[PDB]
Structure 1
């Protein structure tokens, strides 16, 4: 009776890394664990098909935003026992603990595996030449826009491109990335994507505070601080532009830290000026607070598994300190288990300590059963606002009107089962 785990492509050799990760467990339990890697755009199909049919793995990886929807289908084994075994609620950042259950449930259905959090990379050489103190550019909204204005004015040129750097690269192409790149600006203004109000869940995208945050961010791209060509690039293309010395500032996760230490000859960018002049800073505080976007993945046990006892031991293993530290070398992500962040692999690296500083401000979306329909509508409407940005036509009224249509659509979505 062999355990079957479904994972996503979390690391460069994902199945191999998973197998090396669980080798100690396999030896101590005298078993092999079988792993299947789901590519990005079959994963949700496969996991919902397993849920409806009862034909599936023992364990599956779930994105943190999927936990509510799969939990609500009645197919996940409770794992409150596993979480207690790992230290309970105090073992996690609150934003991470929120991803263990359907929103408002008392019962956990997912075990935190790894976190994806986002912070600003910057060129230390470019900010020095522009006269910009990184501490004050990334401390506040006013600092951030003043930094980008100095970066625009700067005579500095990249030593290898012999060209100027764009102040800020951010994508404007409807993807899940656009809502998470917007979320800290929404949150820092005092806004939300959805909230509880008046006895219901509702959109808050058209609240004055959400609109202040969204407008602050999107307007930077209309002020000359984001190149036109950045708005149609995906997240991989923006990362490649930063490596190639085209971008002074961009937002990413911790994986870029490792890639900057790997030579070009093995797929990294150690040789590039950007690697040798690399800074990280958390998102700036808005007028109502400082937030860092959390996502990542959790693990869940299908309650139709015939191997539930062994599968819960594997959940405890994967969720626990040693496996949390090890997998992080492989994924480029932060452990979901907060005690793992003390490991010297993080604490002896000044850029990873900065991500752990950023982590203290972590926030995530509400764990709603209907989150994916909310996020689809939010992303489509935000991409309509980015499309106005591409024309130089985003005004506060135009953004309000888009978010009023977003919020009508969201509100109707949340009214349905």
Structure 2
């Protein structure tokens, strides 16, 4: 005789209205192989979950055993002592299968505080009919995009690209395209203001000045979706969360008119920012052993496969992409090449705080107030102020 896992595992899930029934069933499925564990599923709106978790942990009461953690939230929560370390625990038993970026997002200062669940990124969406009418290939770089945009405008009147100007996550493809990045964690050095960062601010302004792209200082989500759905532009950069809305658009009655490609390269690189979700164990959990097993189960190939089949979320396990029903999934077909271009975030406590300086400076570049060099300098200065021990 051996004892079985027992006790309670409270799981806080942040999945949306359409996803939560499936995720509750998957979570409760843990009880099939562990009937003495009581899984208590709770859905927490994603935009409320970070604060709710911090408040419960900080009050030493009512915190879940297992928390669904956005990729940036791993370092956020670990940096304030709220996550159990998972190295040398049974939680990590499924190991090298994960996409490297997804694995990396689970680590904070040399320890593992999560297991990967799903990944996403930004990608270049394109109107196939407008590109076909114009005679152009999907552009693979900013230089190619400028040329393609001019052909699209001449032939069809549409602008090539809607460049999202009011949300800093959409700056990152341009930064990565110039071979740049926000910080060098290893050397505790701010890098957003090196020449690659200056060039990235220059690229976005050039795209608009040259008429390859249009943008807006406000309401950028709606403006971008309306422009792309209507054919005012032929291209936009966006994520999986946009697909259903695009399919409701007037130029996409035939979903076969939508193409998705990786974001374009810049002069010295190519990459798109990384999103997604992991699973973490609360540091103060009274049921660590069952929680380790629960996150292993929810991160497992079997569960990742079911998640894609039911919800079309993108797996982190390389093996799962070889499952026929996964390989032919609409979202996997649209996004896997883009996911191969994902670039890791800086996995630091202040990762999310790095976005606001970009938002402000990119806005000021696009309105003409601030030059690329001053924008990059301002971004770097704000980072040095936020990151007191970085050079």
TM range (shorter): 0.7 to 0.9
Name the structure 2 match of 1:161.
Answer: none
The 3 A distance-change label for structure 1 pair 411 and 331 is: farther
The 3 A distance-change label for structure 1 pair 337 and 293 is: same
User: How many Å separate the matches in 1 of 2:90 and 2:162?
Assistant: 41
Instruction: Tell whether the 8 Å contact from 2:106 to 2:113 is kept in structure 1 after alignment.
Output: yes
Deviation at 1:190, TM superposition (A): 1.7
Indicate the SS of the match to 1:378.
helix
Deviation at 1:324, TM superposition (A): 0.7
- The answer as to 2:129 corresponding to 1:143 is no
- The answer as to 2:212 corresponding to 1:232 is no
- The answer as to 2:83 corresponding to 1:76 is yes
Deviation at 1:307, TM superposition (A): 1.9
Instruction: Tell whether the 8 Å contact from 1:254 to 1:334 is kept in structure 2 after alignment.
Output: no
User: How many Å separate the matches in 1 of 2:222 and 2:278?
Assistant: 23
Name the structure 2 match of 1:128.
Answer: 132
User: How many Å separate the matches in 2 of 1:348 and 1:332?
Assistant: 11
Deviation at 1:260, TM superposition (A): 6.7
- Aligned residues, how many? 381
User: How many Å separate the matches in 2 of 1:196 and 1:123?
Assistant: 39
Instruction: Tell whether the 8 Å contact from 2:16 to 2:45 is kept in structure 1 after alignment.
Output: no
Name the structure 1 match of 2:121.
Answer: 117
Q: 1:280 aligns with which of 260, 277, 289?
A: 260
TM-score normalised by length of structure 1:
0.82
Deviation at 1:240, TM superposition (A): 5.1
Deviation at 1:249, TM superposition (A): 0.8
Q: 1:16 aligns with which of 21, 40, 43?
A: 21
Deviation at 1:41, TM superposition (A): 3.3
User: How many Å separate the matches in 1 of 2:291 and 2:250?
Assistant: 40
Name the structure 2 match of 1:414.
Answer: 387
Name the structure 1 match of 2:280.
Answer: 300
Deviation at 1:119, TM superposition (A): 1.0
Task: Indicate the structure with greater helix content.
Answer: 1
Q: Which is further off, 10-19 or 114-123?
A: 10-19
User: How many Å separate the matches in 1 of 2:34 and 2:152?
Assistant: 57
After superposition, what is the alpha-carbon deviation per residue over 1:240-278, rounded to whole angstroms, capped at 9, x for unaligned? 5433444311122234556677xxxxxx56993462311
Deviation at 1:227, TM superposition (A): 3.5
User: How many Å separate the matches in 2 of 1:246 and 1:320?
Assistant: 43
Q: 1:187 aligns with which of 161, 176, 180?
A: 176
- The answer as to 2:176 corresponding to 1:170 is no
Instruction: Tell whether the 8 Å contact from 1:294 to 1:363 is kept in structure 2 after alignment.
Output: yes
The 3 A distance-change label for structure 1 pair 353 and 42 is: closer
Deviation at 1:23, TM superposition (A): 3.8
Indicate the SS of the match to 1:154.
helix
The 3 A distance-change label for structure 1 pair 233 and 112 is: same
Q: Which runs of 5 or more structure 1 residues have no equivalent in the other structure?
A: 156-163, 262-267
Name the structure 2 match of 1:214.
Answer: 201
Deviation at 1:304, TM superposition (A): 1.1
Q: Which runs of 5 or more structure 2 residues have no equivalent in the other structure?
A: 1-6
What is the correspondence of 1:1-400 to structure 2 with a 5 Å cutoff?
1-8=7-14, 10-30=15-35, 31-55=37-61, 56-80=63-87, 81-82=89-90, 84-86=92-94, 88=95, 90-102=96-108, 104-105=109-110, 107-134=111-138, 137=139, 139-155=140-156, 164-173=157-166, 178-196=167-185, 200-202=188-190, 204-228=191-215, 230-235=216-221, 238-239=224-225, 241-256=227-242, 272-273=252-253, 275-349=255-329, 352-353=332-333, 355-386=335-366, 388=367, 393=368, 398-400=371-373
User: How many Å separate the matches in 1 of 2:11 and 2:185?
Assistant: 36
After superposition, what is the alpha-carbon deviation per residue over 1:93-139, rounded to whole angstroms, capped at 9, x for unaligned? 2221221111x31x2001111111121111110001112112xx1x2
Instruction: Tell whether the 8 Å contact from 1:113 to 1:335 is kept in structure 2 after alignment.
Output: yes
The 3 A distance-change label for structure 1 pair 37 and 244 is: farther
Instruction: Tell whether the 8 Å contact from 2:193 to 2:380 is kept in structure 1 after alignment.
Output: yes
Name the structure 2 match of 1:160.
Answer: none
User: How many Å separate the matches in 2 of 1:119 and 1:92?
Assistant: 21
